Structure formats: structure tokens, C-alpha cells
Design a protein around this ligand. Sequence first.
Ligand SMILES: *[C@@H]1O[C@H](CO)[C@@H](O)[C@H](O)[C@H]1NC(C)=O
Ligand SMILES: *[C@@H]1O[C@H](CO)[C@@H](O)[C@H](O)[C@H]1NC(C)=O
Ligand SMILES: *[C@H]1O[C@H](CO)[C@@H](O)[C@H](O)[C@@H]1O
Ligand SMILES: *[C@H]1O[C@H](CO)[C@@H](O)[C@H](O)[C@@H]1O
Ligand SMILES: *[C@H]1O[C@H](CO)[C@@H](O)[C@H](O)[C@@H]1O
Ligand SMILES: *[C@H]1O[C@H](CO)[C@@H](O)[C@H](O)[C@@H]1O
Ligand SMILES: *[C@H]1O[C@H](CO)[C@@H](O)[C@H](O)[C@@H]1O
Ligand SMILES: *[C@H]1O[C@H](CO)[C@@H](O)[C@H](O)[C@@H]1O
Ligand SMILES: *[C@H]1O[C@H](CO)[C@@H](O)[C@H](O)[C@@H]1O
Ligand SMILES: [Co+2]
Length: 363
Amino acid sequence: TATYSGNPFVGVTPWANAYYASEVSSLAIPSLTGAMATAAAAVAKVPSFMWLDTLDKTPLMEQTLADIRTANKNGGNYAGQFVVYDLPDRACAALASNGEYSIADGGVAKYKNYIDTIRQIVVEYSDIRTLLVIEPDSLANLVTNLGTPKCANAQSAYLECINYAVTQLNLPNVAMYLDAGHAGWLGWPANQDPAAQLFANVYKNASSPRALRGLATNVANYNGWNITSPPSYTQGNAVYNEKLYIHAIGPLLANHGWSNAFFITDQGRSGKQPTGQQQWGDWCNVIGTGFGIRPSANTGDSLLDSFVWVKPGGECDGTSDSSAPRFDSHCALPDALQPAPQAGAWFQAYFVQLLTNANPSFL
Ligand SMILES: *[C@@H]1O[C@H](CO)[C@@H](O)[C@H](O)[C@H]1NC(C)=O
Ligand SMILES: *[C@@H]1O[C@H](CO)[C@@H](O)[C@H](O)[C@H]1NC(C)=O
Ligand SMILES: *[C@H]1O[C@H](CO)[C@@H](O)[C@H](O)[C@@H]1O
Ligand SMILES: *[C@H]1O[C@H](CO)[C@@H](O)[C@H](O)[C@@H]1O
Ligand SMILES: *[C@H]1O[C@H](CO)[C@@H](O)[C@H](O)[C@@H]1O
Ligand SMILES: *[C@H]1O[C@H](CO)[C@@H](O)[C@H](O)[C@@H]1O
Ligand SMILES: *[C@H]1O[C@H](CO)[C@@H](O)[C@H](O)[C@@H]1O
Ligand SMILES: *[C@H]1O[C@H](CO)[C@@H](O)[C@H](O)[C@@H]1O
Ligand SMILES: *[C@H]1O[C@H](CO)[C@@H](O)[C@H](O)[C@@H]1O
Ligand SMILES: [Co+2]
């Protein structure tokens, strides 16, 4: 029912989910006062993506869609936003078990079962335009980290699972964006063609799904969308911002069989530039960051359908507790804010950092 032509971000308004709002209102605001407290309330109204990082999270997707249907009945013209993120052997670059499913233990079949639940929900809510980011930090690893055994070994499963997801969720009311890393990852000249080739193959191998509108970039990262001066940590890379990245890989996708591919770029933590990153590859709770460009389709650039907030600012990227099961050394680096909770959990000091260094400002 909620069909569309062209940019799926035009004609609708991204829904600011209750999940994130609860975090800010119940875990953050009670700790703030005056200006900060009032500004914080505003942050909760900015639409961000809901991550379906576990099967147990799927019922939350239906609830969100239920809320949206109710709102749309009242003049609402809202669209849901979700991230498909539960591949077996997820985040293959990290040694420890990151997700609930593993290839060795029927992971691929379990992934398909996971996708089946999501399809049924989307079919039931075909009246709601659904914008999805497909598996962040998966395909990019296949381009650069095959040197890591866990990734090399996961290649086959990743491609089969992603194909299932893209074909099963190829519905009239859906717009999918395949995660494509970011400028400091696949933006480097040397990685551009191999990346473009892989993405185009995924598209074609899925029979050029109508719903697969393009690629998502900078998900959970901090690059600027259009900064004018190269940060020191970008040394050597001419593609030092997301705009440069999408303009470099876009034509290449076409050369490899994928025309009319558009993009969406995360700017949820890109507001302060340069960042406090001492190394471009440092991705955990980076210090010196702020909320960035607000979600909007008025990008002024043909290739970008919209600025978006995929990674919800305030939700931790990983714990700094060295004895924690999924501890990652990247979260204990000097350019990473500490002490930090487990991935996904609320990290108050980080939320305050983002709010404080926000541009546009909330204060
Ligand atoms: C194409 O789809 C099949 C699913 O049958 C998958 O196993 C394969 O890895 C995919 N190939 C590419 C290049 O995506
Ligand atoms: C970057 O994009 C933002 C949002 O569209 C805009 O406000 C800003 O002027 C742009 N910066 C440059 C240098 O074009
Ligand atoms: C999908 O189809 C509907 C009509 O069923 C249109 O109104 C919409 O613009 C899109 O083409
Ligand atoms: C989605 O909702 C917003 C808020 O009402 C509108 O401004 C927009 O035009 C669209 O209907
Ligand atoms: C609203 O929802 C958030 C996210 O689960 C919780 O952290 C909060 O306690 C409240 O239940
Ligand atoms: C959480 O709830 C508070 C209190 O209503 C709001 O101010 C905030 O915007 C968010 O919805
Ligand atoms: C955050 O969560 C609390 C419960 O812990 C609610 O009372 C509040 O309204 C918000 O949802
Ligand atoms: C909000 O932040 C304060 C500290 O600023 C905490 O004491 C509180 O428990 C909540 O995390
Ligand atoms: C921010 O401003 C609001 C009113 O706009 C106050 O209610 C709040 O206490 C804080 O000062
Ligand atoms: Co139901």
C-alpha cells in the first residue's frame, strides 16, 4: 500500500521510535537539569533507526509498526526505520562471539528463520513504508578482511544470508540500503572497484530487487558528510568524507551492472569535525563527537536520498571492561570514552558528549 517512486524518503516522515525516546527520557533526562535537560528532550524527537540485533527484538518491530499505523490513521504520514543485523558469525573481524548465531551451529538456517519473521511483519504492515539498512559491517569485511580466518570462513554464509534477506524483503512498501562501510574503509581508491564489484554482484544475484534502492554509509561511524579540510587521521585518502565516497563508488556500481543506486549516510555522531579519533580505524565510543546533520531528504545532492541517524547516539559501541566476554581492545584506547558499558547499553557520559558538541545545536 505504502508504495513509492524515486527517493523513498520523500513524501513521508521518519518515525522517532518509542524505544530510543524511552532511553533518553528515562535514562538520560533524570540526570540532567536546566538547558541540558530541555535540550535532551529535543534529541528524543529526532528519528533514528531501530536495530533488530536479536530475534527477541523482532516483536519490537511489530509494536513500532503498530504505533506508526495508529499515528498514520490520525494524519500521520510516518515511515518505519529498521536495521537488519543478526548474521551468523556477525562482526567476523572480532574474535569473540558478537552475535547470537554462529555458522558452525546451524547459523545460516537460523538467519533465514529470523528473516522469515521480519517478512511476515512487513507483509502484515504493507500499509507502512519501511526503510531498512541491511547488515552493517558484513560485506565491507569481505572486501578487506579476508585475511582474517573468521571472515574468510564466513564469506559463503554472508552472501547466502544477505541474498535471502534482500529477496525476501523485496516488497512494494520497502526500501533497502545495503551497508557499504564508509570513506575510511572502502573509500580508499584501492578498495573502490572491488567493493563496487561485490555490491553490484549482490544486487544482480538477487535479480535486481526493485526494493534495493542503494547503499548505506558511515553506519555507526563518525565521518563528516561534506567536510572541507582533510582531518589528520585521513592522511593518504583523497576520499576523506562521505560525499566524496558515494560519488566515487556510485559510477563504479553502474559500470558493474547496478544503475540507479542511491545512498543514505549516517551523521548521528558526525556533528563535530575533526573527531577525537587518533586513528581512522578507531570506531569505539570515540571522544570529541557530537550529534550531526539532522535526518532530511533535502540533501542538495542527487546521489544522497537522505541524511539519517542509523546508530542511535548514546547507545554504546562496546564495553571497556577488560574482563567482559565481548571486550574489544578498541574500546580501551585513549581516544575512546571510558568507562563504557556493554554494546547497545545506554552510555550516559557519551550521550552528554554528543549533546554538548551537537551541530546543529540542541542547546
Ligand atoms: C548468490 O545467492 C546464493 C543463494 O543461493 C548465494 O549462496 C551466493 O553466495 C550469492 N552470490 C553472490 C555473489 O552474492
Ligand atoms: C554540508 O551539508 C550541510 C547539510 O546540507 C550544509 O548545511 C552545509 O552547508 C554543507 N557544507 C558545505 C561546505 O557545502
Ligand atoms: C505505488 O502505487 C500507489 C497506487 O497504488 C501510488 O499512489 C504510489 O504513488 C506508488 O506508485
Ligand atoms: C511527515 O510528518 C511531518 C510532521 O507532521 C510533516 O511535516 C511531513 O510533511 C510529513 O507529513
Ligand atoms: C523504556 O525503554 C528503554 C529501552 O528498552 C529502557 O531502557 C527504559 O528503561 C524504558 O523501559
Ligand atoms: C521521552 O519522554 C519525555 C517526557 O515526555 C519527552 O520529553 C522526550 O521527548 C521523550 O519522548
Ligand atoms: C522511560 O521508562 C520509564 C520506566 O522505567 C517510564 O516511566 C518513562 O515514561 C519512560 O518510558
Ligand atoms: C544519569 O547520570 C547521572 C550522573 O550524571 C547518574 O548518577 C544517573 O544514575 C544517570 O545515569
Ligand atoms: C529547559 O527548559 C524548559 C522550558 O522550556 C524547562 O522546563 C526545563 O526545566 C529546562 O530549564
Ligand atoms: Co502480530
